[PDB]
A paper describes a structure:
To gain molecular insight into the binding of ATP to hP2X7Rs, we determined the cryo-EM structure of the full-length wild-type hP2X7R in the ATP-bound open state at 3.0 Å resolution. The minimum pore radius of the hP2X7R in the ATP-bound open state is 2.5 Å, the same as the rP2X7R in the ATP-bound open state, and large enough to pass partially hydrated sodium ions such as those present in the closed pores of human, mouse, and rat P2X7Rs. Although there are structural similarities within the extracellular domains, the pore and cytoplasmic domains of the hP2X7R in the ATP-bound open state are rotated in comparison to the rP2X7R in the ATP-bound open state. Relative to the rP2X7R, TM1 of the hP2X7R is rotated up in-plane by ~7° and TM2 is rotated up in-plane by ~6° with the hinges at the extracellular ends of TM1 and TM2, respectively. The rotation of TM2 is further propagated into a global rotation of the cytoplasmic ballast by ~10° in the hP2X7R relative to the rP2X7R. This twist in the pore and cytoplasmic domain, much like the tightening of a spring, decreases the overall height of the hP2X7R by ~4 Å compared to the rP2X7R (distance between Cα carbons of residues 514 and 521), likely representing an inherent flexibility of the transmembrane and cytoplasmic domains in the ATP-bound open state conformation. In the ATP-bound open state of the hP2X7R, ATP is coordinated by the seven residues that are conserved in the orthosteric pocket of all P2XR subtypes: K64, K66, T189, K193, N292, R294, and K311. In addition, the hP2X7R-specific residues, L191, I214, and Y288, form hydrophobic interactions with the ribose group and the side chain of Q143 interacts with the 2′-hydroxy on the ribose group (3.3 Å). Of these subtype-specific residues, I214 and Y288 in hP2X7Rs are not conserved across P2X7R orthologs. No cryo-EM density for CHS was present in the structures of the mP2X7R and the rP2X7R in the apo closed state or the hP2X7R in the ATP-bound open state.
Residue numbers in the entry:
A (entry chain C), B (entry chain A), C (entry chain B): 4 to 73, 84 to 432, 473 to 595
The structure:
Amino acid sequence: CCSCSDVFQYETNKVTRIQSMNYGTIKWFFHVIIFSYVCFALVSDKLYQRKEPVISSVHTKVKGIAEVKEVHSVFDTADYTFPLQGNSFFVMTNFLKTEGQEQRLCPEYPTRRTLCSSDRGCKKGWMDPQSKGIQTGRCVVYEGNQKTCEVSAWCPIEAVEEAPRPALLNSAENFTVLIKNNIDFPGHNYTTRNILPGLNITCTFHKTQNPQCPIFRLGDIFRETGDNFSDVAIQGGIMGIEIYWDCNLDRWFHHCRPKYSFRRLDDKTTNVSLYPGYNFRYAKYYKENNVEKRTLIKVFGIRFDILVFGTGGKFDIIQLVVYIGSTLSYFGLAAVFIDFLIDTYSSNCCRSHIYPWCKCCQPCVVNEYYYRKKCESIVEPKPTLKYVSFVDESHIRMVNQQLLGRSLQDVKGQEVPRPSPVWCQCGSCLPSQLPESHRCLEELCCRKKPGACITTSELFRKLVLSRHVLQFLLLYQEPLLALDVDSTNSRLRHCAYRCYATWRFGSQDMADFAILPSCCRWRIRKEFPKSEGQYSGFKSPY
Amino acid sequence: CCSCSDVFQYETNKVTRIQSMNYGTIKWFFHVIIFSYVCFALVSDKLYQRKEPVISSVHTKVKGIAEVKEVHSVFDTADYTFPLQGNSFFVMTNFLKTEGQEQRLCPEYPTRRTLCSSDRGCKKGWMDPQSKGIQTGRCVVYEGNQKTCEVSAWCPIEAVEEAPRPALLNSAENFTVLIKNNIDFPGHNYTTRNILPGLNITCTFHKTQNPQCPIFRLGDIFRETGDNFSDVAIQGGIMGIEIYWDCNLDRWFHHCRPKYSFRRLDDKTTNVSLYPGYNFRYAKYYKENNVEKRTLIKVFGIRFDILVFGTGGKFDIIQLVVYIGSTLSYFGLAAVFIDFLIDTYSSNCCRSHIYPWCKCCQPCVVNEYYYRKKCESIVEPKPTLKYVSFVDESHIRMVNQQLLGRSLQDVKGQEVPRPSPVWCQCGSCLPSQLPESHRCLEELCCRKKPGACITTSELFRKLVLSRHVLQFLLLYQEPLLALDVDSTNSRLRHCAYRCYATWRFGSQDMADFAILPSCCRWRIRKEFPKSEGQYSGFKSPY
Amino acid sequence: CCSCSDVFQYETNKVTRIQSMNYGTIKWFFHVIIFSYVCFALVSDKLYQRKEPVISSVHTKVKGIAEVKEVHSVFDTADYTFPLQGNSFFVMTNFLKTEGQEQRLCPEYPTRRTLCSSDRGCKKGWMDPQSKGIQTGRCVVYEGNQKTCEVSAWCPIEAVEEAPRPALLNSAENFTVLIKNNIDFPGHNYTTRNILPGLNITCTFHKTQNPQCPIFRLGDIFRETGDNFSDVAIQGGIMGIEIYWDCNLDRWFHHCRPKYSFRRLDDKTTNVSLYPGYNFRYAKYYKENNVEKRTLIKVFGIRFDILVFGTGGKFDIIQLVVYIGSTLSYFGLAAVFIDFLIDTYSSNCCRSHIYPWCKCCQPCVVNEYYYRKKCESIVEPKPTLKYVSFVDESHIRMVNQQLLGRSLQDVKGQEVPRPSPVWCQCGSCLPSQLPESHRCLEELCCRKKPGACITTSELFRKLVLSRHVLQFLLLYQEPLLALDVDSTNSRLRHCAYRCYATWRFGSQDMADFAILPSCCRWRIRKEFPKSEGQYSGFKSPY
Ligand SMILES: Nc1ncnc2c1ncn2[C@@H]1O[C@H](COP(=O)(O)OP(=O)(O)OP(=O)(O)O)[C@@H](O)[C@H]1O
Ligand SMILES: Nc1ncnc2c1ncn2[C@@H]1O[C@H](COP(=O)(O)OP(=O)(O)OP(=O)(O)O)[C@@H](O)[C@H]1O
Ligand SMILES: Nc1ncnc2c1ncn2[C@@H]1O[C@H](COP(=O)(O)OP(=O)(O)OP(=O)(O)O)[C@@H](O)[C@H]1O
Ligand SMILES: Nc1nc2c(ncn2[C@@H]2O[C@H](COP(=O)(O)OP(=O)(O)O)[C@@H](O)[C@H]2O)c(=O)[nH]1
Ligand SMILES: Nc1nc2c(ncn2[C@@H]2O[C@H](COP(=O)(O)OP(=O)(O)O)[C@@H](O)[C@H]2O)c(=O)[nH]1
Ligand SMILES: Nc1nc2c(ncn2[C@@H]2O[C@H](COP(=O)(O)OP(=O)(O)O)[C@@H](O)[C@H]2O)c(=O)[nH]1
Ligand SMILES: *[C@@H]1O[C@H](CO)[C@@H](O)[C@H](O)[C@H]1NC(C)=O
Ligand SMILES: *[C@@H]1O[C@H](CO)[C@@H](O)[C@H](O)[C@H]1NC(C)=O
Ligand SMILES: *[C@@H]1O[C@H](CO)[C@@H](O)[C@H](O)[C@H]1NC(C)=O
Ligand SMILES: *[C@@H]1O[C@H](CO)[C@@H](O)[C@H](O)[C@H]1NC(C)=O
Ligand SMILES: *[C@@H]1O[C@H](CO)[C@@H](O)[C@H](O)[C@H]1NC(C)=O
Ligand SMILES: *[C@@H]1O[C@H](CO)[C@@H](O)[C@H](O)[C@H]1NC(C)=O
Ligand SMILES: *[C@@H]1O[C@H](CO)[C@@H](O)[C@H](O)[C@H]1NC(C)=O
Ligand SMILES: *[C@@H]1O[C@H](CO)[C@@H](O)[C@H](O)[C@H]1NC(C)=O
Ligand SMILES: *[C@@H]1O[C@H](CO)[C@@H](O)[C@H](O)[C@H]1NC(C)=O
Ligand SMILES: *[C@@H]1O[C@H](CO)[C@@H](O)[C@H](O)[C@H]1NC(C)=O
Ligand SMILES: *[C@@H]1O[C@H](CO)[C@@H](O)[C@H](O)[C@H]1NC(C)=O
Ligand SMILES: *[C@@H]1O[C@H](CO)[C@@H](O)[C@H](O)[C@H]1NC(C)=O
Ligand SMILES: [Zn+2]
Ligand SMILES: [Zn+2]
Ligand SMILES: [Zn+2]
Ligand SMILES: [Zn+2]
Ligand SMILES: [Zn+2]
Ligand SMILES: [Zn+2]
């Protein structure tokens, strides 16, 4: 069935170009706003570029010294900064040291959960998360008359003490951090650093004056987020330095520079905050007197997490070509909307109810014309599909229901606008010669109500029964037909059926399923007799 | 060529509305399942919301003490936890310390790769990854009769010793970790913490009883993943605490709370595992006797990586509007499928082979009707395009092939259903007056097989040759044509060609490329003579 | 208005199948390249699989020892590696130690910013980021005649000293790192490790010979990126070990193995580099003589960041089904292009200018035929819409403009190809009986230029005025119409208007808005008189 002809064939939809100005306004508005929006998305979001995330690597150095008044001591970088290499770094701003701790037995600190009245109160080997040593069955005196359960631990047990305010290293707001950041785009093959040639180191980052100096003062970091460093220093906190690398690697429009933002990554430290701060414990272990002692320090400080994010984009053909396709179909949505306004405003319900009431959508009656000139109604050509027309009526009843042993005259069907026997009402219908219930189909009168027949009209005589016009139509199809055979009379009879069907039913597909009235059918059979045998019924082409 | 009329014009496709119930079933099923699926994707995946990832910041504190039996010592937080600030934290559960190491020369430990028979076996300066000191040319006795190559290193060299089982700090399953987690959505501007007001600290996380208490017991973490802490503690491992923040920031339906999950990020520790555990080495450096010594500790423990992931979504108009478009086109796929079932079930191969065999798809013959009423066949109007019809046949041969100096009577063409000279077979065809090979086109007889001609039929006389009907048709187009000029006879002749072409070829576009038989053409020319000059050939409109 | 019939109805577009070979070539080329491309995207990018990122966990151990010549000492793993657990690890390759530092007062190192001429130069309590101690008002002699401001700090203050070249631990290129990496796909439930059973540990990673051995020599890592380890070791650097896990978890085609790549994450160390290296400071605190001293070490080394990335994919039905839809519409773009080539090449401007000049796109004239057989022009049926035809002309003027009190004869309209009073030019037009300005519409002559009328032609007499043909047409619609009533004469008159409108205007929708000439209208009214009252005007159906 296939051929080079079937291969080389193009399908294009039949369209009807409506000249409606209103529809033109709507269509152009939709297309313009979709184009204006999608063109923006392309320019603003750089959807024409292939984009790659940064591969960052941060190195931080804190400079500054603090005079701690605990005797006065001096704290350098090696004293307050802890070995956090990478994105985050820590700056201790407060501490509580319990020095000289040695592994031995000692009375517990008088916490409310450690007081005893006798040795019966304290258990042996008992441990709980708030306990700083394994309890012993004895309850020793701590000091004076205070009796606390004795434990084996690093002694003296560190006191339950509030964080010392003001912060011992509240000078930490004067410390500066240099942040060296290298980004790499491997797919785009572009490496760069936030430190540029000719960079003064005496600078300090300022949001406007010096936005590209990577030496940030900690106090300025805190005052750029509306935080109080003095309050945060006492108990600690978490702060965050965002570095945003928005880079386009096009040589025409090239810019790949960092943008520094600051954001507290912790709950605000208020007077009634719930479990605030950032503290941990670490110990310095030293051997003296041939015994190992430790200095236990509870460190409260600010942890600065450095969050380097960004993207580097370079122009790519493939990305633009896909985005194009996506934006190209959006324009089509305009048609769907208007096609709906055509289908909805074509319904008879619009004219029945809404038009007489609103009276504002009255000139929207042309949608019936548009729908008539756009959509065509076609019914499944099932065998049960039939059509019946009566003279007294102006509409054709589609008989879609298979006859339940009832005369087709009585059978009711769906109305369609046009493009003697008991059932007979004209007086000229003859009884059906068809057997079984097949006769039901042929039991059809020319009109529903009693009155004059249709075959009595001279139009039926000189149009359907006229041998001249039928013979002329036969010659038209076959210019050399043999007219002396009884098959000529049979073809004459077939044409009379098809002309009554087309004369009465305007459409050809509607006349394909025509069933003629008994009066007209038998008048035709008399005018064009077959004596070979029984006449055949209506037979559906499908 | 452009006009405000061209600007304001709408294109809508012509459609034919099929009333097929089967096609309606298929279309509605497709639309319903696409709508039901896409509505789900919207509700389930929250595709109507703009979603942002969390910006987390974890702070962990481990509480608990262990009685290590190595002499009995006590290990606090500062003793087993190592300075890992951030997501991960480490809890030492085993160790091997080689204390008192001093920088000097010593015999190597008797590893199989360090035994010597004499000083010739050991090289000077030799180093390999399993060597713990630079070898010296001498081979000193370690102990008794064991001779091992002498090295310069921290001495005594740490023994190659198995991890001490049971774990020295197997009490570490009783330790609790508080995890403080703050998430931030900057675009949505929403900050929150996993610790809520009114949080008892005596709680411990339970999967059902207390799911929101952020104090996790390590043994419970391990038993919630079916791990044996006692086996993992001996050699170490890696564990992972996932915190899932699924948040929707809509005030109507607001919930942003963590969900804690546990997952071992390490290979299961079996009896025959390959290189299991998690250990490292670190040294404590102390100066005594004015010389620097170090305690080298091989630490085996569990590293808990805290993996905070999630998304916070808030309702956005733009996201819903794009998703709508995507889901809106899926419905259209229903038409493609049915349109195919129409195009496929219309082919003659369906009736030729499949219908007589299967006999089940017999009522699917209406697809031929649907295809006839939907698709129209149109052929390229190239100059070579021609049409030839013979009386004895019922189909028209499209002559698409340019004539290779052969009479058009002999030329064969593709069949199309209808909507004396050697080549002559009727006896009335006259020789072509056309010159060169142009005559070939005009060398065409009314019929393929010998027999009666077509011009002898009275229909050709009173339809094509009839001056009355031709003159009437001319008056129809021009109601005031001058009938006394020879141009009237020329227009009469042109109409006779066009009527024979339309009488014989039903379609107008098929009659545009008609080539009349020589007999009919010359009969027309005789009935409507031109004596001014030679008659013109068939000339294609394109 | 709704019915089970409206529910079960299918919309299919009317298409015209063009047999153009050129259009077939273009359509098949577009479809083939779209299919060939989208099939590739599916195979290459594995778009048919659901893909999940890895959940990695890296553990690193460095082996190797260095002979440092500072007296000769030996550095083990515990000496050069710093407590960096996780992805990154650090290997010290150089240092500068200032040992024996004690908290006291000392002269500042003679930096250019610390020299004084007297105690007036140095301030008390002054601090700046390059200062290593709080200044005191006194200016003490450092050595000889060098006078430097005295400070309180850890003394002696560390000298401003260049990094010692060659690197003290330049043997660090001989160190090996074992990297243990476990990936987990939770959604796909697949866990694996880069260390396989039967793995020799004597191996060292080689790009080709031994690509899966996870023991990397640092010198080889540097020589695989074209770096000089000896130069990098002196001042430090940042290096990166990428581990790529491209896994497909389909049992048929299963492969999940790592791929090791190396990339320097730092600026190249040249002779004139800007702020190169990677160094920090840390202190060892020891108590001797009952006083606390510290050894301050400036460590220069290489930080190796381990970047584990990858994806594991498994076949998913839903992902393939969505991708299908996206690729399925791309094919449709072929039609849009050709439909445009049809619409563009149909314009008259193509034939007017481009065709006579280029002469190469001459056979592209068939696009006019395609457009004629594809697109149909329809005009809004507004009440103001009118049509006027004159005998002397061959085109119909659409009068879309509402008449401004001017005779319709004078009014000009847009030309459309066909499918006595002052305004009168025929001499037979009668004055309008219509009142107000409504007469303007009826003031229309049969022709624009003076000459013979149209009603004098016998065709108008025997077609429009002929009572026989009009009566026959009336009988056709109603085979039993009463012909003896004056309503028969009124229907005769209505049919004469509609036939003149259809005889003159070919289209039915164009004849719906016809306005007849005054001569023909009044001739019809005389031939079919109404004496009941005034005759009505042209009234628009909409
Ligand atoms: N926190 C800081 N505040 C101000 N300047 C700084 C800071 N950290 C480093 N610098 C300066 O930046 C320059 C380059 O820094 P870098 O640390 O790489 O070199 P450096 O010689 O090792 O620095 P230094 O020895 O002073 O710690 C140096 O001149 C250093 O003085
Ligand atoms: N691992 C843990 N197990 C149980 N409770 C804990 C743990 N870590 C902290 N807590 C309790 O949680 C509360 C808040 O913790 P947070 O550390 O911020 O305050 P804190 O006073 O510094 O804690 P602490 O001094 O007891 O270490 C404290 O009351 C503390 O006792
Ligand atoms: N950097 C390295 N170079 C070479 N081999 C190594 C390195 N690190 C570990 N190995 C070897 O890999 C094997 C498994 O490593 P793993 O550390 O898990 O076991 P281990 O017994 O604790 O190793 P070790 O005690 O030798 O440090 C061991 O046999 C070890 O010798
Ligand atoms: N449209 C239509 N066709 C009919 C009707 N009755 C019969 N036919 C057609 O006419 C044919 C039978 O005609 P018939 O009277 O038997 O004459 P014969 O076929 O020459 O013997 C069948 O093929 C039918 O398709 C009718 O009521 N309406
Ligand atoms: N359809 C069709 N048209 C023809 C044929 N032969 C000639 N014509 C048309 O008739 C015209 C030539 O007619 P001709 O005999 O020369 O009469 P003349 O044009 O008045 O001199 C040309 O324009 C052709 O388009 C034919 O076989 N078929
Ligand atoms: N197409 C067209 N229709 C017309 C014209 N003039 C009148 N009509 C129609 O003819 C009808 C009026 O005819 P009229 O002379 O009053 O006869 P009557 O309706 O029987 O009284 C109206 O319904 C109009 O639609 C015209 O110029 N062109
Ligand atoms: C920070 O420095 C300024 C000037 O150097 C000084 O006035 C201020 O007191 C310092 N802050 C603290 C907390 O010491
Ligand atoms: C990246 O760019 C450098 C400089 O042009 C070039 O030497 C190198 O080969 C490039 N790498 C790739 C992967 O193309
Ligand atoms: C850096 O800036 C400071 C600002 O006071 C200036 O004094 C100094 O000279 C600058 N250094 C250089 C190298 O420009
Ligand atoms: C900052 O904190 C300090 C000490 O807590 C307090 O004295 C001061 O008033 C605070 N400043 C502001 C602006 O709240
Ligand atoms: C953990 O604690 C429970 C009760 O506090 C105790 O019975 C158990 O022995 C402890 N586990 C270890 C390993 O010490
Ligand atoms: C975030 O919310 C707070 C509280 O309403 C408001 O003060 C702040 O300005 C907001 N930030 C932004 C970026 O809108
Ligand atoms: C916390 O829970 C424990 C459970 O035993 C209870 O004893 C204790 O009183 C609770 N504390 C508070 C503050 O509710
Ligand atoms: C857990 O490990 C210990 C020591 O390795 C062993 O005695 C015990 O049976 C193990 N428990 C289970 C459930 O395997
Ligand atoms: C690295 O080892 C090789 C052979 O073991 C040796 O020749 C070379 O000198 C070593 N490199 C350094 C910097 O010591
Ligand atoms: C993952 O696979 C293992 C082995 O088949 C199975 O025991 C376990 O239940 C699976 N987990 C899930 C979430 O299906
Ligand atoms: C590992 O490879 C080395 C290569 O020299 C070889 O000598 C050694 O025997 C191998 N070990 C094993 C267990 O195969
Ligand atoms: C590597 O560095 C060393 C010392 O800086 C130098 O002697 C040697 O020439 C360098 N090698 C190369 C290939 O540049
Ligand atoms: Zn009857
Ligand atoms: Zn009847
Ligand atoms: Zn012939
Ligand atoms: Zn012939
Ligand atoms: Zn006139
Ligand atoms: Zn006139």
